[PDB]
Coordinates of C-alpha atoms in Angstrom, one line a residue:
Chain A
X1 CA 60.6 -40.3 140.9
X2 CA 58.1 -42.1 140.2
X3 CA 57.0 -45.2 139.5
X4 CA 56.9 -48.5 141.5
X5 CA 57.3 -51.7 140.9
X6 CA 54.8 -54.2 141.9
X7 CA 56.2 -55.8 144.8
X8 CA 56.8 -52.2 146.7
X9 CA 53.6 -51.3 146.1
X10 CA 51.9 -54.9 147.4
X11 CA 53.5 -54.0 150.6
X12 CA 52.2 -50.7 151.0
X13 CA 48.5 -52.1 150.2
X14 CA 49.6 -55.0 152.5
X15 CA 49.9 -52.1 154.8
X16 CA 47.4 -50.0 154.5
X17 CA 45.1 -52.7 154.6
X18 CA 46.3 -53.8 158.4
X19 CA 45.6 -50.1 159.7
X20 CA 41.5 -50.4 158.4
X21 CA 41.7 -53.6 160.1
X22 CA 43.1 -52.1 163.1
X23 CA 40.5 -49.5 163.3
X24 CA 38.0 -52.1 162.8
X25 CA 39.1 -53.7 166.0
X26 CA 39.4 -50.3 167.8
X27 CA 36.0 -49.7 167.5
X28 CA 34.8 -52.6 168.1
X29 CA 36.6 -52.3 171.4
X30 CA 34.9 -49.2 171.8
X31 CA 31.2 -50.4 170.9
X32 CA 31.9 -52.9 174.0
X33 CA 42.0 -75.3 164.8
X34 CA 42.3 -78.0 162.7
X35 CA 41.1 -81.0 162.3
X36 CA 42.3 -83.8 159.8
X37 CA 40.0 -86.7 159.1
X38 CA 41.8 -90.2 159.8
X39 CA 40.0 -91.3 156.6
X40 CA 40.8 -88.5 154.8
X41 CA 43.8 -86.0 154.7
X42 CA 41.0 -83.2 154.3
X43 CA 42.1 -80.5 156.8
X44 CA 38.9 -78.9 158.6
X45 CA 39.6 -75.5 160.0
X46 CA 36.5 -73.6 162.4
X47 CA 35.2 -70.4 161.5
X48 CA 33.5 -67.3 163.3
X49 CA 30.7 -66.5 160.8
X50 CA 31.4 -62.8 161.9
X51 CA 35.0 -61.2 160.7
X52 CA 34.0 -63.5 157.3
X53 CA 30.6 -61.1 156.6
X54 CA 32.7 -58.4 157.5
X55 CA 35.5 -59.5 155.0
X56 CA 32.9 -59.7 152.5
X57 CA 31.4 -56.5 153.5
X58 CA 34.8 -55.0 153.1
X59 CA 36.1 -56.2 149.8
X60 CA 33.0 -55.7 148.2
X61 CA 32.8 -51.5 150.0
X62 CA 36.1 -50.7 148.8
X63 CA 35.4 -52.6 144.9
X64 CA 32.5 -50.1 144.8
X65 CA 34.6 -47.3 146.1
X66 CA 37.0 -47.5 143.7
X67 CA 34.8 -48.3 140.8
X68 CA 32.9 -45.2 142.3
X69 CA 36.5 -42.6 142.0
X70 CA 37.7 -44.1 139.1
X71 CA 33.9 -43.3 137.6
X72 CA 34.2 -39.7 139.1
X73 CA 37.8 -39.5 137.0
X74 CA 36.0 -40.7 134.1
X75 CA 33.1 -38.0 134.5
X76 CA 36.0 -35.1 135.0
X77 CA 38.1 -36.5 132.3
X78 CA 35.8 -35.8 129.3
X79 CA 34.3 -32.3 130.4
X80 CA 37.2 -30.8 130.8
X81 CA 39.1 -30.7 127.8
X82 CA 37.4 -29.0 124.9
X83 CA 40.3 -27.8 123.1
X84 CA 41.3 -29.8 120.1
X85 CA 38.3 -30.9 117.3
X86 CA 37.0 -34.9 117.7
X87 CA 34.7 -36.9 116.1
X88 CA 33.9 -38.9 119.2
X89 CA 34.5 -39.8 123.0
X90 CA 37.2 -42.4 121.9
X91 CA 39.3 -39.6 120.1
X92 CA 39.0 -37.6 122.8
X93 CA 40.5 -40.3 125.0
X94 CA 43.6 -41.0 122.8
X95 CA 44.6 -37.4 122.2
X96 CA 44.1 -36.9 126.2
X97 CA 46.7 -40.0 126.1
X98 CA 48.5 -37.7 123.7
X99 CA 48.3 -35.3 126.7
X100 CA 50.1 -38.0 128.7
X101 CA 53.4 -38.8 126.4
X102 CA 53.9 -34.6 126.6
Chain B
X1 CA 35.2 -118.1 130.3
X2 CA 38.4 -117.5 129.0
X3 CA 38.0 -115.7 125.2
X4 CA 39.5 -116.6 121.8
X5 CA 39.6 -113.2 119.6
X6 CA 39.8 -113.6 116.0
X7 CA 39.2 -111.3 112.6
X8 CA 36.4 -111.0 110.2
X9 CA 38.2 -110.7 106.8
X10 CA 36.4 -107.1 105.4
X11 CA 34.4 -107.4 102.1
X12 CA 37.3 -105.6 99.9
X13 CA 34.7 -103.2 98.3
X14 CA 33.1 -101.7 101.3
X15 CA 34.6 -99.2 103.3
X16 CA 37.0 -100.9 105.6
X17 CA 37.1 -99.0 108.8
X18 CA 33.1 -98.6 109.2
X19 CA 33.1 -96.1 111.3
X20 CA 36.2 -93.9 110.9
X21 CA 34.8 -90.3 110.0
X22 CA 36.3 -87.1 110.3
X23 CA 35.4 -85.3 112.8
X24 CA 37.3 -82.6 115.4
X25 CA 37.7 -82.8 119.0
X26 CA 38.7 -80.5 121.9
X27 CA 40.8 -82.6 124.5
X28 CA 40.6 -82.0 128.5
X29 CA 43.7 -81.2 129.7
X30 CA 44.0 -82.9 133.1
X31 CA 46.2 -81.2 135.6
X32 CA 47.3 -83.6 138.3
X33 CA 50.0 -81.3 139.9
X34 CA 51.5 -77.7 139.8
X35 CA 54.8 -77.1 138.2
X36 CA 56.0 -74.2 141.1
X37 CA 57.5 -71.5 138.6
X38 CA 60.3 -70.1 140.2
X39 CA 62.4 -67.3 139.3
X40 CA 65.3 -66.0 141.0
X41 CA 60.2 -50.5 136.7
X42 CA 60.5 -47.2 138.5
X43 CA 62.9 -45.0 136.6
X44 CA 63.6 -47.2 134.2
X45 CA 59.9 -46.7 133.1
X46 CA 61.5 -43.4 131.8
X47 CA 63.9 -44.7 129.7
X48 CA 61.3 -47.6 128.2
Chain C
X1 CA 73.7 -69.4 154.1
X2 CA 76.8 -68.0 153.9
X3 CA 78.6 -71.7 154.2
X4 CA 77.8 -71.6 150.9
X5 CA 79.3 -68.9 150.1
X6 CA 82.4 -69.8 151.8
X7 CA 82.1 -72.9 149.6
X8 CA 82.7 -70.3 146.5
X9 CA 85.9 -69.5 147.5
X10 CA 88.0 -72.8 148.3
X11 CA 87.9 -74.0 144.4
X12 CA 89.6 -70.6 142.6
X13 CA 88.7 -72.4 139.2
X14 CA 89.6 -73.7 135.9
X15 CA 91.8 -71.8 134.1
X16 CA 91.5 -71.5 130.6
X17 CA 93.0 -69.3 127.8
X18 CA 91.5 -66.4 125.4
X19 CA 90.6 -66.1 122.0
X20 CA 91.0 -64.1 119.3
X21 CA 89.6 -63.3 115.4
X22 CA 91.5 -65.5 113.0
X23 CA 89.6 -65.0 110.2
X24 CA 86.7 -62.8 108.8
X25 CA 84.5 -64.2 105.8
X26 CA 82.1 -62.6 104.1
X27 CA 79.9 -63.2 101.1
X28 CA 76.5 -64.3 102.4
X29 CA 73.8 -61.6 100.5
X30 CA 71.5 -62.1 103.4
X31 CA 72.1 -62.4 107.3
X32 CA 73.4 -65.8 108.7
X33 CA 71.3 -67.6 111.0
X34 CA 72.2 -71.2 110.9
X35 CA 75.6 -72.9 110.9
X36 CA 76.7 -76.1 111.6
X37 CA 80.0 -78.8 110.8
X38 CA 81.0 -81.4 109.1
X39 CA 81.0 -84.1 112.1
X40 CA 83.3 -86.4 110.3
X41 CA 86.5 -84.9 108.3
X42 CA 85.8 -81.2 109.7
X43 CA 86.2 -80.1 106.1
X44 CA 83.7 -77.5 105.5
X45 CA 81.0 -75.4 107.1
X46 CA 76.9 -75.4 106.1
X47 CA 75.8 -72.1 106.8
X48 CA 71.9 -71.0 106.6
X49 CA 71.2 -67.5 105.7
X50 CA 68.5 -65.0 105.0
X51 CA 68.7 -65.1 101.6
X52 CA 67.2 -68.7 101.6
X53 CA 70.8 -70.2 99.8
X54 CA 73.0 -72.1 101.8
X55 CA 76.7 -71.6 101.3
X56 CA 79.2 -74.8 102.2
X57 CA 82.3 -72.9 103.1
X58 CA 86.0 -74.7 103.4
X59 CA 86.9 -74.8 106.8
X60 CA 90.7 -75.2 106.1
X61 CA 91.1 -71.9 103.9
X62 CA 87.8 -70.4 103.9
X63 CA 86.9 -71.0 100.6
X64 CA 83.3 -71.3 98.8
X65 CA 82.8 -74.6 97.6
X66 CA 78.9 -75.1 96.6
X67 CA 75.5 -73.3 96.7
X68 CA 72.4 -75.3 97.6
X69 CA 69.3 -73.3 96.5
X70 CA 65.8 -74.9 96.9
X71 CA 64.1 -72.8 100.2
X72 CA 61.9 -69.7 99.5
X73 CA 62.1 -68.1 102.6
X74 CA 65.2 -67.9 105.2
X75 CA 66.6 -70.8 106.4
X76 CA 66.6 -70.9 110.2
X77 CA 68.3 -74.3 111.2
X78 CA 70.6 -76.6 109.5
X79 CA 71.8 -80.0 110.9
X80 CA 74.1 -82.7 109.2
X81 CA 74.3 -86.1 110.4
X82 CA 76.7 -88.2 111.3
X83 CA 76.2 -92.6 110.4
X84 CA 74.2 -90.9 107.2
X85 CA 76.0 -88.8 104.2
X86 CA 72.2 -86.7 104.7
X87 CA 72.1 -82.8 105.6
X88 CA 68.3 -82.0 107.1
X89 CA 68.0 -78.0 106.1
X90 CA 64.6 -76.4 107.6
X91 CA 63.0 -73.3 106.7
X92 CA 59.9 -70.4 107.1
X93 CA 58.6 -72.0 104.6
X94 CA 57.4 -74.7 107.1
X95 CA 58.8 -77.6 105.1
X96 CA 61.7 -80.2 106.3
X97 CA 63.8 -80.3 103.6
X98 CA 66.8 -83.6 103.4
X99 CA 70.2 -83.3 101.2
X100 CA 71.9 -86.3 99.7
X101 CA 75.6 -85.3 100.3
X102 CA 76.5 -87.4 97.3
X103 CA 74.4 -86.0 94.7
X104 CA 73.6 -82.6 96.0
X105 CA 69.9 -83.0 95.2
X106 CA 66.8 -82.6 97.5
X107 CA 66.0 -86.3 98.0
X108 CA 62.7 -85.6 101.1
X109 CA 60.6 -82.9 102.0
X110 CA 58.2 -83.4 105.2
X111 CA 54.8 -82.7 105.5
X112 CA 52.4 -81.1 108.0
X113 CA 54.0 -78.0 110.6
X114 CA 51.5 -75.7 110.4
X115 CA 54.4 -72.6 110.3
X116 CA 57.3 -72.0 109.8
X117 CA 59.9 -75.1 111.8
X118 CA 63.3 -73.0 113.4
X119 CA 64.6 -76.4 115.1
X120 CA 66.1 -79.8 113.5
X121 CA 68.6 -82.1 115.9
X122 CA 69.0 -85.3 114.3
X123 CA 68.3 -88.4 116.9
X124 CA 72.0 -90.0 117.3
X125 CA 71.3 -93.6 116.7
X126 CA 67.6 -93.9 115.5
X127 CA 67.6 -92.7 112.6
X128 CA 65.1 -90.2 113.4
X129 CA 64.3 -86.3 113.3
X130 CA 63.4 -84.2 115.7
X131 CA 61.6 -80.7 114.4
X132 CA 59.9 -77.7 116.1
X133 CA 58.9 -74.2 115.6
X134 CA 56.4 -72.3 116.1
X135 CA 53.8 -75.0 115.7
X136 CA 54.2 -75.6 119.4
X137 CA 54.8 -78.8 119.0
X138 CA 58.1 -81.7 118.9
X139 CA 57.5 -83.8 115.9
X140 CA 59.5 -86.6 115.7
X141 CA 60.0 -87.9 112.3
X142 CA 61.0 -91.2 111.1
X143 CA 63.6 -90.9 108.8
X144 CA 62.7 -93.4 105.7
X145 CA 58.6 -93.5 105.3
X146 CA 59.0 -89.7 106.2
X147 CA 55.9 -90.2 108.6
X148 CA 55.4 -88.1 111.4
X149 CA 55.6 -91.1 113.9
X150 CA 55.7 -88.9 116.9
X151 CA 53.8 -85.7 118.2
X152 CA 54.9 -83.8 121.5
X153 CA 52.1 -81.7 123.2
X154 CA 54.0 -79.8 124.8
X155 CA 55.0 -76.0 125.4
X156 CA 52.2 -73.1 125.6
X157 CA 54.1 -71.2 123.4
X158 CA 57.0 -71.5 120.1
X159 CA 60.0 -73.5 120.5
X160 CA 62.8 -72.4 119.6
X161 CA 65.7 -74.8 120.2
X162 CA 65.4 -78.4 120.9
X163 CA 68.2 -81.1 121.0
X164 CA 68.3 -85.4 121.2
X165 CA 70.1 -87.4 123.4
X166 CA 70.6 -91.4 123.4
X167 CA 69.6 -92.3 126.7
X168 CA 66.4 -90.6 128.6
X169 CA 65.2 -87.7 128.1
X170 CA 65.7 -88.6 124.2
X171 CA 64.8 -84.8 123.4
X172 CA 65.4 -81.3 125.7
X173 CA 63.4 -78.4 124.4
X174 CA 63.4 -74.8 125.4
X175 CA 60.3 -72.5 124.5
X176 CA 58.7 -68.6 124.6
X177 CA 56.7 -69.9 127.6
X178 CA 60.1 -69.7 129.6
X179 CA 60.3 -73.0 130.5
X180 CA 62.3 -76.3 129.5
X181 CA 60.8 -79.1 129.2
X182 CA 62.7 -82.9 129.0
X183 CA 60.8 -85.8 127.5
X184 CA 60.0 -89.2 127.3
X185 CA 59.1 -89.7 124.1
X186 CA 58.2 -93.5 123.8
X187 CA 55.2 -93.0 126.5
X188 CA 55.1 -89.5 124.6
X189 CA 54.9 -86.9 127.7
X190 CA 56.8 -84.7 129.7
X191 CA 59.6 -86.3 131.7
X192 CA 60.7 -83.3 134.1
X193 CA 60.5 -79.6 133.5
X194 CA 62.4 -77.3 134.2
X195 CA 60.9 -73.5 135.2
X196 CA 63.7 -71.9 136.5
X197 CA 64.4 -69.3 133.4
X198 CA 62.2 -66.3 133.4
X199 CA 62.1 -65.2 130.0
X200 CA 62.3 -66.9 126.5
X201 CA 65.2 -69.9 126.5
X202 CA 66.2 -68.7 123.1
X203 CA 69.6 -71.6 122.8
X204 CA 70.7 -74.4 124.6
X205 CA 73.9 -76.5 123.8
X206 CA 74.9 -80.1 125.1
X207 CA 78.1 -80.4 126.6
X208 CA 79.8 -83.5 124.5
X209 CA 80.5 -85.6 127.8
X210 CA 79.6 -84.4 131.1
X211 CA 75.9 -85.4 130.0
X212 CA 74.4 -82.2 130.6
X213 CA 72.9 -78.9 129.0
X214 CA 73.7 -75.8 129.1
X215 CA 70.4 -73.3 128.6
X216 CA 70.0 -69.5 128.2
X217 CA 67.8 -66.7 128.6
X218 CA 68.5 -63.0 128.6
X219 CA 70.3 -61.9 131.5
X220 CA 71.2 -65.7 132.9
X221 CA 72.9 -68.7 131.3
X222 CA 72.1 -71.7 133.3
X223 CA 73.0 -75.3 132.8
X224 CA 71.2 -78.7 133.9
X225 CA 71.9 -82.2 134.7
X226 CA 70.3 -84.1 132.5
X227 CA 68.9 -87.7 133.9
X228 CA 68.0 -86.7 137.3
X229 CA 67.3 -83.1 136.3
X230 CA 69.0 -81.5 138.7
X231 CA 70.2 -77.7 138.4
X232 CA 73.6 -78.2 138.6
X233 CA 75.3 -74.8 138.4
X234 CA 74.8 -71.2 137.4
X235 CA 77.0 -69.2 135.2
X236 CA 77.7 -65.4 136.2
X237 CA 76.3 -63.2 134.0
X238 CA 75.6 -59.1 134.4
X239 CA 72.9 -58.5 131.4
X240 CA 74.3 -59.7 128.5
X241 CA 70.9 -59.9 127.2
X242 CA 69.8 -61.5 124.2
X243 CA 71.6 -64.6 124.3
X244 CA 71.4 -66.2 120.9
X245 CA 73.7 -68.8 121.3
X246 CA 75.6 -71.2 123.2
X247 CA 78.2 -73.8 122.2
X248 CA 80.6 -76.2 124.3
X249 CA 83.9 -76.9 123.5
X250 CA 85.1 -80.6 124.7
X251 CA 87.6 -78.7 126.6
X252 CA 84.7 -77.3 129.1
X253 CA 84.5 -74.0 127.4
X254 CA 81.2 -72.4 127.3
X255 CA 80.6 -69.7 124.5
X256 CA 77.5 -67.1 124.9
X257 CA 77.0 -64.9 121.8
X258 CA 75.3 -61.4 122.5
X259 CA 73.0 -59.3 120.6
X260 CA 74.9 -56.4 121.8
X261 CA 77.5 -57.9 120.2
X262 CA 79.6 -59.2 123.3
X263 CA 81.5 -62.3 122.9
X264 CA 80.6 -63.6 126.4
X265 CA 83.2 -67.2 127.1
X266 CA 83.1 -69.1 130.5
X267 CA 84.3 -71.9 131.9
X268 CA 81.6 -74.5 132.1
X269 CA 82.5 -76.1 135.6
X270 CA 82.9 -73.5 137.5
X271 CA 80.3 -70.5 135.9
X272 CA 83.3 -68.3 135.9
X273 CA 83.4 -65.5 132.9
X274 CA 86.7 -65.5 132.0
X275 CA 86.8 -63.1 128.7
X276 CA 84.2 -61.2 127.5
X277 CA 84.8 -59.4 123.7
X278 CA 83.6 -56.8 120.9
X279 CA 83.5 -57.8 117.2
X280 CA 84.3 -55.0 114.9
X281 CA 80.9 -54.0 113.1
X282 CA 81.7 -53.7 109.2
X283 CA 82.9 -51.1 106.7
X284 CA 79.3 -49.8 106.3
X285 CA 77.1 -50.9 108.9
X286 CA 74.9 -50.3 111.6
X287 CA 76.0 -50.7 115.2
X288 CA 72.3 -52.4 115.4
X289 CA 73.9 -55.0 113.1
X290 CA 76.3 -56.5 115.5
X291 CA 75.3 -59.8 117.2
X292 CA 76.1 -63.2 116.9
X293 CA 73.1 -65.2 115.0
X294 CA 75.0 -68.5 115.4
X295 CA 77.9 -70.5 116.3
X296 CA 80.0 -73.9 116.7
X297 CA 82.9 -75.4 117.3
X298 CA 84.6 -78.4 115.2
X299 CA 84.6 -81.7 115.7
X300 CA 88.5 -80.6 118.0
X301 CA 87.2 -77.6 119.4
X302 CA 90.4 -75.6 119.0
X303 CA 88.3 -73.2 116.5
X304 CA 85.0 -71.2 116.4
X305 CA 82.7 -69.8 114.1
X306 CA 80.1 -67.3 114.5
X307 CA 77.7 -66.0 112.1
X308 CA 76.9 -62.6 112.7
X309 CA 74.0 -60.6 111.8
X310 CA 76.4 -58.2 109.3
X311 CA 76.3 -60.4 106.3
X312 CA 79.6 -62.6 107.5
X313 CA 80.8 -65.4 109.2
X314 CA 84.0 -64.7 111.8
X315 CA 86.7 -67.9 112.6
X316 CA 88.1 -67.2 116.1
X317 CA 90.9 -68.9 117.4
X318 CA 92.4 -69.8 120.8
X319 CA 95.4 -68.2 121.4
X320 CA 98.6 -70.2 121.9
X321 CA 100.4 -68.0 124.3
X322 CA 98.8 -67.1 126.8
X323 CA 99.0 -69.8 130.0
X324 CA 100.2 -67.2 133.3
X325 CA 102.3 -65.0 132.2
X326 CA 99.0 -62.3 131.9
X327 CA 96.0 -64.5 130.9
X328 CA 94.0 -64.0 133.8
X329 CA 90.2 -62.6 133.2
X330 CA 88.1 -61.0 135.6
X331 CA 90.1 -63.3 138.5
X332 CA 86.7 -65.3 140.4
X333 CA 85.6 -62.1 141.9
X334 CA 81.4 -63.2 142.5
X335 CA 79.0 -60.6 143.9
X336 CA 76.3 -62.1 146.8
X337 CA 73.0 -62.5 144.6

């Protein structure tokens, strides 16, 4: 209906992910090798230090985003139901589960 | 210097084997090379 | 990569003929999960069971001859050798118990898995054992002193099935991990592996000549070259999942037991299926209680017998009329991958 399996849904991140990247670009627009040691087989490969702080910047802005949505959920998740009797939080939780299997 | 190697015949009463002791030991494992692993839902997850 | 695929289509393989149920047994209190054959005379069966007894069957008539009592727990492998008048039974009760044939009296027991051992082969020309279970580990055992000469680190998880061979790799096994692994056992490490299965290899089998294997998992029975290592072929297979068991006929038949209770037989060149069966569940069973636990062939190969998980053992033979007239199976129809 349904559910996906995990190779599917890799794409669709894959996807997603190149349209941010895209937009990146764009508006950066709009603000406007290798090497292989003879001694060695080590492979040597230059780097612009920007585009690798803005990697890091992004992995790290959407970890805390989702940590962030997934805490909101959490918040929701115990004020709303009030219905049933529990002895604690963790009850709660497993009879919302019970919720779930309806 | 070459060498000549030759045993020393143990008194019979002390403990032959001076220093084998019981004792345990956690071994490295040393991984020279990867073994690829290679093989060959959305419903279903409904039925199962 | 079609070339291939025309290179399916000039052999139009191997045929074979059918089987059919001789002969249904019953008499075991417990399931049956362990059989295995006289290698000399083909007089009698030794089959495990559940209810820790072992039963030594006729093979001519079917008959009961002895009981051999002596496990606490199931039995889960039992192997009889061949230069030695010895029967290696092994257990839950993670203990390798031998049989003097002559005497009928527990002569060995060997020392030190740390649970329960589902797998003895018997080396061919060593005089040797080779045990495994859910220790994780191969222990080859010398025979006589009973001393666990050899230790195989080895799988990440239990091994169920393991086998011996005279030349290199002197022992295939097949573990939970999903992998099968072929050894060298006098330097003591892994030879070659073999990663291809993607769930537990529950059986393998080794075809009397060719000097290969034949390895299962749920949904695919492969095989392997053995020496180089090579894959060799595939066998067609829809799920048929669980595989419990696999045995080769010298003829180049390949039998797959099912837990759903399909009698799966191929030829083993070609991967071709060409019968697939039902057993008949029992007067008062449960359709759960249909599988195959088991199964051999003699020392001919003109006869098979299964174990099942309803408290019998079944004797199917290979039907003598058959040849064209209508044998032909499902006829070498194979989908694209």
């Amino acid at each position: 209906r349904g559910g996906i399996s995990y190779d599917q849904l890799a794409k669709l991140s894959y996807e997603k992910t190149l349209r941010n990247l895209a937009t990146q670009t764009q508006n950066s627009s709009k603000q406007d090798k290798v090497q292989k040691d003879t001694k060695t087989g080590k492979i040597t490969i230059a780097d612009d230090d920007k585009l690798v702080n803005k990697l890091a910047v992004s992995l790290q802005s959407e970890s805390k985003k989702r940590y962030e949505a997934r805490k909101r959920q959490m918040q929701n998740a115990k004020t709303l139901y009030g219905v049933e009797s529990f002895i604690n939080d963790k009850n709660k939780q497993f009879n919302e589960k019970l919720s779930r299997e309806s | 210097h070459h060498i000549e190697v030759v045993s020393k015949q143990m008194d019979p009463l002390l403990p032959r084997f001076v220093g084998k002791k019981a004792r345990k030991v956690v071994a490295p494992t040393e991984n020279d090379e990867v073994v690829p692993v290679l093989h060959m839902g959305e419903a279903d997850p409904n039925e199962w | 990569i079609v070339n291939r695929y025309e290179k399916l289509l000039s052999q139009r393989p191997e045929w074979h003929a059918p089987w059919k149920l001789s002969r249904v047994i019953n008499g075991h209190l417990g399931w049956v999960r362990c059989v295995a054959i006289d290698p000399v005379d083909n007089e009698w069966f030794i089959t495990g069971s559940n209810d820790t007894t072992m039963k030594v069957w006729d093979l001519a008539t079917g008959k009961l001859k002895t009981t051999l009592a002596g496990h606490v727990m199931t039995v889960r492998d039992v192997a009889v050798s061949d230069r030695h008048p010895y029967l290696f039974s092994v257990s839950e009760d993670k203990t390798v118990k031998c049989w003097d044939l002559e005497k009928n009296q527990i002569i060995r027991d060997y020392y030190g898995h740390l649970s329960g051992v589902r797998t003895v082969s018997i080396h061919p020309t060593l005089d040797l054992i080779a045990t495994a279970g859910r220790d994780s580990v191969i222990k080859l055992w010398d025979m006589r002193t009973r001393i666990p000469v050899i230790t195989l680190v080895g799988h990440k998880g239990p091994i169920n099935q393991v086998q011996c061979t005279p030349v290199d790799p002197q022992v295939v096994s097949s573990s939970t991990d999903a992998t099968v692994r072929l050894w060298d056992v006098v330097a003591g490490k892994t030879m070659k592996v073999l990663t291809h299965h993607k769930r537990s290899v529950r059986a393998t089998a080794l075809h009397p000549k060719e000097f290969s294997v034949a390895s299962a998992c749920t949904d695919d029975i492969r095989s392997w070259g053995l020496a180089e290592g090579s894959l060799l072929t595939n066998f067609e297979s829809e799920k048929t999942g669980i595989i419990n068991t696999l045995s080769i006929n010298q003829d180049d038949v390949l039998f797959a037991g099912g837990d759903n209770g399909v009698l799966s037989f191929y030829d083993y060149k070609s991967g071709h299926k060409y019968q697939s069966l039902a057993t008949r569940e029992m007067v008062g069973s449960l359709e759960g209680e249909r599988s195959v636990l088991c199964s051999t062939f003699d020392k001919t190969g003109l006869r098979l017998i299964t174990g099942e998980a309803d408290k019998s053992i079944k004797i199917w033979k290979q039907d003598e009329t058959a040849t064209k007239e209508s044998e032909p199976g499902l006829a070498w129809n194979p989908n694209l991958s």
